[PDB]
């Protein structure tokens, strides 16, 4: 039924190692040649709150791009490559349009990124699932070096942060971009940005930094690299930052997308809420050494990336680990 | 003269490999640790009569990456990755203005193809060059796995051809162009296509698809690749195509991006001629087994590029290697 339409965008995101998959509870993998010693690096995530926009919108083409990035961004952060992708999908009563849709994205967001979708599952629940809502888990596997895991260890006084733009909103904070259309009275549809509707770069689909990052990490000196996802610069950019040291974010670096600034005025919502909630236009902080920012910029400026010089990291003792100034 | 306004472009393409300072007399750059057997590809390029044409219009800043397309994209062909690039910018009397801006196109490529502009040399000759007349040369060195090499002879017959579509007319044929618009009193800049002026069609800098090639030949089974430059289609193809093949071209896989629609109907261009002359909106051509025509279209597609099913590949003793049906 299902399994009839989504065969063929499962198989044309199979890599030259993937032995098996969708045929029992059991993928078949084997390891890229190339590790010595590899180490594998694994994480998990859902899109959250979006998912109840896209139903709102009827489109649920991009919801599957959402999950794989919030899963293979948080990868890369450690130098791990990727290597496959598996998905549990709860609904109630399963849609076969919609389930197709999002697998369909979810295949997107695995060719992006070089992995493969080797398996998942359907599960139906009429019981704890009202209307055609439905949840979906996103699960990958990556492979690093040992010697090249990127620890955050080498950060120190002196370094520079470097900043990678958003598409958008992407996958965090949408329970307000909700309460702020519902307080609003807005139709995201209706009204225009842009030259594009409010429900574009709402819905727009997360950026996937990984073939960037992972060809950054080779040709330059990086010191850690951080993600930004729920609690915007407040949250993810401590993460990455060693003992006695402050970021100090430089707001003038950069002008926020009209989402932001369209979600700032909407809502009224304050300086610090707005770097909590939402990630302001950055998706992605890196971190590395003053005499390798020339080169940093100009490998990702040059490879469909927005990068810029956002800030600094200083020797410091203050609680308050992030400041934009 | 000029080495302090492109001291700052050059530096910034730095690879790790690299070794040393300003690069005056003696370029050094180790190899890459990956490769175990490392073979050296090497070739020289020239941009040709489009230089003409960028005189004409005043735009000298994309030039350099027709020039580095031309070298890099014909590497990648054997599998290899760009290491480093080489310029010599030939002029009467040097225009600090219009030589940094060729040498920033230059860097803009390297960028995106990821090798270091490692050298130059910029020669004055008195009573050759007349004008602003400039003529620039390029140098690259890619390196590839012994045990990786693509030279062709995999390819046999049932195979299938995948199109990696063109930004334009790139870097060939353009004496044509100059001529269709003389004989047509045509202004590149007046007139209107689709949106943008002709010129902009005309001077497109030519696509780099070395990250996108390097990147299918590790996921996919590549069998031979062509880059269409001089001599197009009908020179090209059979290039890389082994005794008793046959390249049968599809023509309604894809139509000719509106520029090459605008030549043939001003200078009324034949069939053959436009496919010899021009890429017809063709980069790329790729030869691969059928079974690995529907990942390769996938990982090519969701990655920057506009790939499709272009023809096939037969067993024939025909003399015409190439049929464009």
Chains 1, 2 share one sequence.
């Not at 970021?247 to 670096?253: H, L, P």
Request: glycine share 12%.
């Amino acid at each position: 039924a299902l399994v009839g339409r989504i065969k063929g965008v499962v198989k044309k995101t199979r890599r030259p190692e993937v032995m098996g998959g969708l045929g029992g509870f059991g993928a078949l993998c084997a390891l890229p040649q190339k590790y010595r010693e590899p180490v594998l690096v694994s994480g998990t995530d859902g899109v959250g709150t979006k998912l109840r926009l896209a139903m709102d919108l009827k489109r649920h083409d991009t919801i599957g791009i959402d999950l794989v990035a919030m899963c293979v961004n948080d990868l890369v952060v450690q130098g791990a490559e990727p290597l496959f992708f598996l998905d549990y999908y709860a609904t109630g009563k399963l849609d076969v349009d919609t389930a197709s849709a999002v697998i369909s994205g979810i295949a997107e967001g695995c060719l992006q990124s070089g992995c493969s979708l080797v398996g998942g599952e359907t599960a139906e629940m009429p019981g704890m699932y009202h209307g055609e809502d439905y949840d979906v888990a996103g699960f990958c596997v990556g492979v690093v070096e040992k010697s090249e895991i990127i620890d955050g260890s080498k950060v120190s006084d002196g370094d520079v942060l470097i900043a990678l733009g958003s598409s958008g909103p992407h996958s965090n904070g949408y329970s307000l971009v909700r309460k702020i259309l519902e307080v609003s009275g807005c139709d995201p549809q209706t009204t225009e940005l842009d030259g594009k509707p409010l429900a574009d770069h709402l819905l727009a689909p997360t950026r996937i930094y990984v073939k960037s990052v992972l060809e950054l990490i080779e040709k330059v000196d990086v010191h850690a690299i951080a993600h930004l996802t729920g609690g915007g610069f407040w949250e993810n950019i401590p993460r990455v930052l060693p003992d006695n040291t402050q970021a100090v974010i430089d707001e003038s670096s950069w002008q926020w997308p009209e989402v932001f600034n369209w979600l700032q005025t909407a809502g009224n919502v304050e300086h610090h809420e707005m770097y909590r909630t939402f990630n302001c236009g950055v998706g992605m902080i890196i971190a590395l050494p003053a005499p390798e920012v020339d080169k940093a910029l100009a490998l990702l400026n040059a490879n469909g990336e927005n990068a810029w010089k956002i800030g600094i990291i200083k020797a410091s003792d203050s609680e308050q680990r992030v400041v934009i100034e």
